[PDB]
């Protein structure tokens, strides 16, 4: 995790990635989804 | 005739707050991204505020970031910035433009309307 | 963050010929930038959108061309109108940044 004020897109520069967890599910997985999040306000009616 | 008329500059001491606001006509208020812009004379150009279509989003400068504060009523066609703990250094113009959408990204087209401006002053 | 730093600061050039203003980031910004026409205390004018697209009804004069970091607006057969100051901006990425300012002169 960094601090960024950068490119919209990735920022050139270079930052290692660290190991947090190891977690045998031992499935053959093809494919994945990002799940997003919602945000509703003060304004908002919470209307989906 | 897409226009915006900025109102509200005026002199101020530091420590002050006012509130510029723009009226904007000539297109759809509600679906479009305002932003405000202002000159210092001495410096240049500078991007100070910007709302999301919806109103929701709403990104500033660091300088302004607790003091300024940019909203906008589309029922009323007006985009609204109310300033906080001016200094000497906001005296500016202040330039109310229609924004592209950051979604285009990499062909951004940039701020395609502007505004005459309205100067505030920030002064003992 | 992203600066941008036009070059010259001034020019003065006679009427007719080719001027070139020229934009460099400091890191790439992609096709992300136009450029505004500003006359004295008049607001600015957006010539050029996508580093090289004509905004409505601006002149055919006015181009921009750019690749890299580097970027270009040249205007073409120099008028009177032209006397302004002519800044760039990229809206690659936040926060959104102009450069310093161009300002042209007519040569007499």
């Known amino acids: 995790h960094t601090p960024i004020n950068l490119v919209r897109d990735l920022p050139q520069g270079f930052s290692a990635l660290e190991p947090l967890v190891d977690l045998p599910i031992g499935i053959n997985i093809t494919r994945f989804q990002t799940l997003l999040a919602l945000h509703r306000s003060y304004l908002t009616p919470g209307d989906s | 005739e897409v226009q915006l008329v900025e109102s509200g500059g005026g002199l101020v001491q530091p420590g002050g707050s006012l509130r510029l606001s723009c009226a904007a006509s000539g297109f759809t208020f509600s679906s479009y991204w305002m932003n405000w812009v202002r000159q210092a004379p001495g410096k240049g150009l500078e991007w100070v505020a910007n709302?999301?279509?919806?109103?929701?989003?709403?990104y500033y400068v660091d300088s302004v970031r607790g003091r300024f504060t940019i909203s906008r009523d589309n029922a009323k066609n007006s985009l609204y910035l109310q300033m906080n703990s001016l200094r000497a250094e906001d005296t500016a113009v202040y330039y109310c433009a229609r924004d592209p959408y950051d979604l285009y990204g990499d062909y951004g087209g940039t701020f395609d309307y502007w505004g005459q401006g309205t100067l505030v002053t920030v002064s003992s | 963050d992203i600066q941008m730093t036009q070059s010259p600061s001034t020019l003065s050039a006679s009427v007719g010929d080719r001027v070139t203003i020229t934009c460099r980031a400091s890191?790439?910004?992609?096709?992300?930038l136009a450029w505004y026409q500003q006359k004295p205390r008049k607001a600015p004018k957006l010539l050029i959108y996508?580093?090289?697209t004509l905004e409505s009804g601006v002149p055919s004069r006015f181009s921009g061309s750019g690749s890299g970091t580097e970027f270009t607006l040249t205007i073409s057969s120099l008028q009177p109108d032209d006397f302004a100051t002519y800044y760039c901006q990229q809206y690659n990425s936040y926060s959104l940044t102009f450069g310093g300012g161009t300002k042209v002169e007519i040569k007499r």
């Open positions: 996508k580093a090289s």
């Open positions: 709302i999301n279509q919806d109103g929701g989003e709403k």
């Open positions: 890191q790439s910004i992609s096709s992300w």
